[PDB]
Design a protein around this ligand. Structure first.
Ligand SMILES: COC(=O)c1ccc(CNC(=O)[C@@H]2C[C@@H](O)CN2C(=O)Cc2cc(C)no2)cc1
Lengths: 86, 139, 102
């Protein structure tokens, strides 16, 4: 039901399985808990928002909002997004 | 992959429910994309088009893809108008990140941001009608 | 309405969603469900404000304008029954920055 994702700096992120299974990288790392030696909490907290965003709006007629990204985190997020395939 | 030349008037409403400047794009009888005046973020516009004509919608500044009535291509199909609801898709987190990054940085300076070289080629692969028409023109 | 929250305590952080009409005590069940710890023995806050078990989260001020999938609202969580610990939430890692862009 829920799984745990942990940042390079130890913070834990508890999220639904399904939400998490949105990343094939994560999908594969559970086949429970997963440590990410290379993503800090400020990046992985956005990932998770993106999971919750993706799941809320995928398959929806009422207008969808822009997922926002600060300028400071864009580069770390790009690299995570690339790694996590999502 | 072109418009059908039916000559049957057909009246459309483009409603832009996106926060972008929308660029509607009509596919011409020989398949060539043809751009029409751009539609602001809240805003709407009645359009005379024609049965069987093809349209697709893109962000006017940067060509990001947008959806119309949920699919990728709109075809004017009663009793007055047909509704083309233009929405953001759920981008991928990667595409999204590309967008911000492209939007924040003169494309000359990609070389100089510290990231894997598979990412530089990704940033410089700007979305574009022609390419997408080739993904589309194969399914 | 769904309401999209981030339940936060220490280095622990839970992403969940709930109705605007759900009660604080019901959020507490959800946590119990997850962190294996019962409604008494935990307290919830908005910012610093201590929340009343019987109120709606929409009265506690988590609303749809406010707690959005892509920018969820935070709920502070505290433990011990037996004298209760004080509300501590570890901040997140700082981004570097920037450069050569603006
Ligand atoms: C603010 O301007 C506009 O958005 C606007 C919108 C539509 C028009 C006139 N209509 C068109 O250009 C349509 C749209 C598309 O169906 C192609 N087109 C044509 O008239 C070309 C054509 C000719 C025949 C015969 N069937 O189609 C002129 C201006």
């Amino acid at each position: 039901m829920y799984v745990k994702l942990i940042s390079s700096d130890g913070h834990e992120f508890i999220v639904k399985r399904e939400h998490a299974l949105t990343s094939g990288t994560i999908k594969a790392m559970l086949s429970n808990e997963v440590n990410f030696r290379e993503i800090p909490s400020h990046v992985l907290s956005k990932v998770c928002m993106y999971f919750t965003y993706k799941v809320r709006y995928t398959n929806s007629s009422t207008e969808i909002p822009e997922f926002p990204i600060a300028p400071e985190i864009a580069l770390e997020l790009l690299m995570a997004a690339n790694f996590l395939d999502c | 992959l072109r418009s059908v030349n039916s000559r049957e008037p057909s009246q459309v409403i483009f409603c832009n429910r996106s926060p972008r400047v929308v660029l509607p794009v009509w596919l011409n009888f020989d398949g060539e994309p043809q751009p029409y005046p751009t539609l602001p973020p809240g805003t709407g516009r009645r359009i005379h088009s024609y049965r069987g004509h093809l349209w697709l919608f893109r962000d006017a500044g940067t060509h990001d893809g947008l959806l119309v009535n949920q699919t990728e291509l709109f075809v004017p199909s009663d009793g007055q108008p047909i509704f083309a609801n233009i929405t953001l898709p759920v981008y991928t987190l990667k595409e999204r990140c590309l967008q911000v990054v492209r939007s924040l940085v003169k494309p000359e300076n990609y070389r100089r941001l510290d990231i894997v070289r598979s990412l530089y080629e990704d940033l410089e692969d700007h979305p574009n009608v022609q390419k997408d028409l080739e993904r589309l023109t194969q399914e | 309405m769904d309401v999209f929250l981030m339940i936060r305590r220490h280095k622990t952080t839970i992403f969940t969603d709930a109705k605007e009409s759900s009660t604080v005590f019901e959020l507490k069940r959800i946590v119990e469900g997850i962190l294996k710890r019962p409604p008494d023995e935990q307290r919830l806050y908005k910012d610093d404000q201590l929340l009343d078990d019987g109120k709606t989260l929409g009265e506690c001020g988590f609303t749809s304008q406010t707690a959005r999938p892509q920018a969820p609202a935070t709920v502070g969580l505290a433990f011990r029954a037996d004298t209760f610990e004080a509300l501590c939430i570890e901040p997140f890692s700082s981004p570097p920055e920037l450069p050569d862009v603006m």
